[PDB]
Amino acid sequence: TQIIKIDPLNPEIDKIKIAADVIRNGGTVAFPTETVYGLGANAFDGNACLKIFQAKNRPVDNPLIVHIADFNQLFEVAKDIPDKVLEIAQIVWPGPLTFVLKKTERVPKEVTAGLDTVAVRMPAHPIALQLIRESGVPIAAPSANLATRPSPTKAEDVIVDLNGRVDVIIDGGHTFFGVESTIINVTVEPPVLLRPGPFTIEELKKLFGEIVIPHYAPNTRLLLVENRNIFKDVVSLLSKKYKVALLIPKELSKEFEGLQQIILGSDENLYEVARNLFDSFRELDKLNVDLGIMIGFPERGIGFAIMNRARKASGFSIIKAISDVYKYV
Ligand SMILES: Nc1ncnc2c1ncn2[C@@H]1O[C@H](COP(=O)(O)OP(=O)(O)NP(=O)(O)O)[C@@H](O)[C@H]1O
Numbered sequence: 001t002q003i004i005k006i007d008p009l010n011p012e013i014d015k016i017k018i019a020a021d022v023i024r025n026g027g028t029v030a031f032p033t034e035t036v037y038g039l040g041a042n043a044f045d046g047n048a049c050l051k052i053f054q055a056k057n058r059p060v061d062n063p064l065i066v067h068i069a070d071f072n073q074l075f076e077v078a079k080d081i082p083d084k085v086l087e088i089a090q091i092v093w094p095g096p097l098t099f100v101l102k103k104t105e106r107v108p109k110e111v112t113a114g115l116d117t118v119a120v121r122m123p124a125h126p127i128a129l130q131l132i133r134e135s136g137v138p139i140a141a142p143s144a145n146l147a148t149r150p151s152p153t154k155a156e157d158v159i160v161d162l163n164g165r166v167d168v169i170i171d172g173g174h175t176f177f178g179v180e181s182t183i184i185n186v187t188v189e190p191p192v193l194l195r196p197g198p199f200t201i202e203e204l205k206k207l208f209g210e211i212v213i214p215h216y217a218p219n220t221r222l223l224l225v226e227n228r229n230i231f232k233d234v235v236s237l238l239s240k241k242y243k244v245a246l247l248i249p250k251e252l253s254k255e256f257e258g259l260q261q262i263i264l265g266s267d268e269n270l271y272e273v274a275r276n277l278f279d280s281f282r283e284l285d286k287l288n289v290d291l292g293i294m295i296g297f298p299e300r301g302i303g304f305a306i307m308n309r310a311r312k313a314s315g316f317s318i319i320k321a322i323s324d325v326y327k328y329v
């Protein structure tokens with residue numbers, strides 16, 4: 001694997017070209033975006049895309065998001081797009097919002113998992129956009145991690161997971177949001193939120209008033225305490241019988257000195273928490289503890305995506321009442 005360091009905000013186009021040549025040659029390139037790093041291949045090349053599944057050891061029926069750098073490309077991969085969706089795509093892209101649309105015959109089965117639809121987004125990251133532009137083709141690209149590990153948000157995460165398994169890894173620093181793009185299905189009416197992300201429910205509702213609102217997790221047991229009023233008592237109860245690691249905001253650090261802590265960021269900035277979430281899950285597994293205990297966060301804005309990933313990462317081991325401790329431990 002060639003690891004190429006490229007400045008994320010002013011990328012050296014010559015370095016981008018090295019990676020684009022690999023994409024055009026049917027190879028795989030891991031690269032940063034504003035959400036998480038993605039592992040990409042030419043979206044029109046089914047055989048190249050199968051290499052993404054092989055590298056991640058991913059079940060072949062879990063479809064891939066296609067990344068485009070301009071609107072001409074949107075029409076190469078999707079069709080029968082509603083006028084309103086097109087107008088909105090033009091104001092939200094490049095950005096962390098993925099649309100599920102009807103696919104064209106140029107999108108291979110390897111990308112869509114046989115579905116009649118294709119998920120597409122335009123990444124708000126200079127390296128991703130330039131990689132796509134120089135490759136001259138849309139790039140299919142799920143998160144760049146091994147199958148059960150948390151989505152990567154920094155180059156080192158990708159290296160640890162995929163070094164030796166992919167052709168190129170672009171080391172472009174830490175990703176901006178740290179959580180995967182919001183996914184909305186607009187082939188159905190009203191549209192449906194398939195995955196919360198950096199593009200908020202609050203904003204989607206202003207654009208799609210009718211929208212309907214319905215594992216990458218650590219291996220160490222992880223409990224999520226959604227009720228902040230019982231957090232201290234839950235920690236006291238559990239730390240008596242277990243070696244614990246607390247995933248918490250810096251504002252609660254002093255309250256728990258003596259116990260292993262994984263600081264997520266500040267309560268006053270949920271984007272900080274979102275940015276450090278997946279790497280905090282990785283840290284949990286590096287530590288040698290019996291269980292991680294994460295505190296809940298507000299669901300305003302990106303808080304909703306934070307909680308969605310946390311619930312899943314905890315295998316839905318949620319503590320809302322102190323007596324719930326009986327259920328999951
Ligand atoms: N045509 C589709 N219809 C419905 N959902 C789709 C479709 N295409 C892609 N998706 C979804 O997109 C998800 C993949 O997101 P993507 O970020 O490309 O890869 P990932 O690594 O699976 N994401 P994540 O699990 O958070 O790392 C799939 O697991 C589906 O949830």
Ligand SMILES: C[C@@H](O)[C@H](N)C(=O)O
Binds near residue numbers: 036179180
């Ligand atoms: C790689 C990154 O773009 C991922 N596919 C997402 O949609 O967040």
